[PDB]
Design a protein around this ligand. Structure first.
Ligand SMILES: O=C(O)c1cc2cc([N+](=O)[O-])ccc2[nH]1
Length: 280
């Protein structure tokens, strides 16, 4: 018999100025859409239009780069579009920007980890943005050994990128770092997204690059702030969720951090969007 009832979470108002008072100049939105076509049918684009981000990162598009829905043409102000998908119907990431990036790359430079369309790297003047859909550990943890290999290769790759330019990593990292990051830590310690191996990998990623978890850095003691809820058992209406989607930043970008938002009420997927405001 289920132990959780509703838990309130009200994302605070958008702080659009840096701690020094500098207005935000860049708004990035990241969203695991759980199928680009399904998300469009569920009015996901109408939400993007209201949010009006400068850069939109999408994960789990499940769409081949050569089968993109024609409705994507109804997104003005995000004309530079980049997509990665497996060598259709699984994984897939997208990055849509108002301004053209200096360079766009796909993957993490390792053949073993570059066949499932999980990563886009876009270099800009002041920083390099990476969007990722991290491999899920799987039912029965059958992909956990592979996920640990992925974590090490990704950490090495990001540390290399950060040594040249400040980094922003966003996306569905498929781990709730700490107990405060999910509604049911006790029942999920042996499930994908909350194994000690995955949590330890997330801690290693923050320490080694290094990177700061933008949301937790700003709201260190705030509970019930999630970005994913299973479609089953009315989990979203009870706020039985997990915070799997993040914006991780280089320490040098902390003075530029205005806010890191969780758009809780935005429908269209089993994940909600997250939004970052930077004063670059
Ligand atoms: O590196 C930077 O300082 C920077 C890149 C960038 C891109 C957009 N955009 O609209 O795609 C807006 C503001 C931006 N700032």
């Amino acid at each position: 018999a289920s132990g959780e009832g509703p838990a309130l979470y009200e994302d605070p108002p958008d702080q659009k100025t840096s701690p020094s008072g500098k207005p935000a100049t860049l708004k990035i939105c990241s969203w695991n859409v759980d199928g680009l076509r399904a998300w469009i049918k569920k009015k996901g684009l109408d939400w993007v239009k209201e949010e009006a981000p400068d850069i939109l990162c999408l994960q789990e598009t499940k769409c081949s780069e050569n089968k993109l829905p024609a409705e994507l043409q109804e997104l003005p102000g995000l004309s530079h579009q980049y997509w990665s998908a497996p060598s259709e119907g699984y994984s897939g990431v997208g990055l849509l920007s108002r301004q053209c990036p200096l360079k766009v790359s796909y993957g993490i430079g390792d053949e073993e980890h570059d066949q499932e369309g999980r990563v886009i790297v876009a270099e800009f003047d002041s920083f390099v943005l990476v969007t990722a859909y991290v491999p899920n550990a799987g039912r029965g943890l059958v992909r956990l050994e592979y996920r640990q290999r992925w974590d090490e290769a990704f950490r090495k790759f990001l540390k290399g990128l950060a040594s040249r330019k400040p980094l922003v990593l966003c996306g569905d990292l498929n781990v709730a770092h700490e107990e405060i990051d999910l509604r049911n830590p006790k029942g999920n310690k042996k499930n994908a997204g909350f194994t000690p191996q995955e949590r330890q990998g997330f801690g290693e990623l923050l320490q080694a690059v290094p990177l700061a978890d933008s949301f937790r850095h700003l709201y260190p003691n705030t509970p019930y702030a999630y970005t994913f809820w299973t479609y089953m058992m009315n989990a979203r209406s009870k706020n039985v969720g997990w915070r799997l989607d993040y914006f991780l930043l280089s320490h040098s970008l902390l003075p530029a951090l205005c806010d890191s938002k969780i758009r809780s009420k935005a429908l269209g997927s089993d994940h909600c969007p997250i939004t970052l405001y930077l004063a670059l």
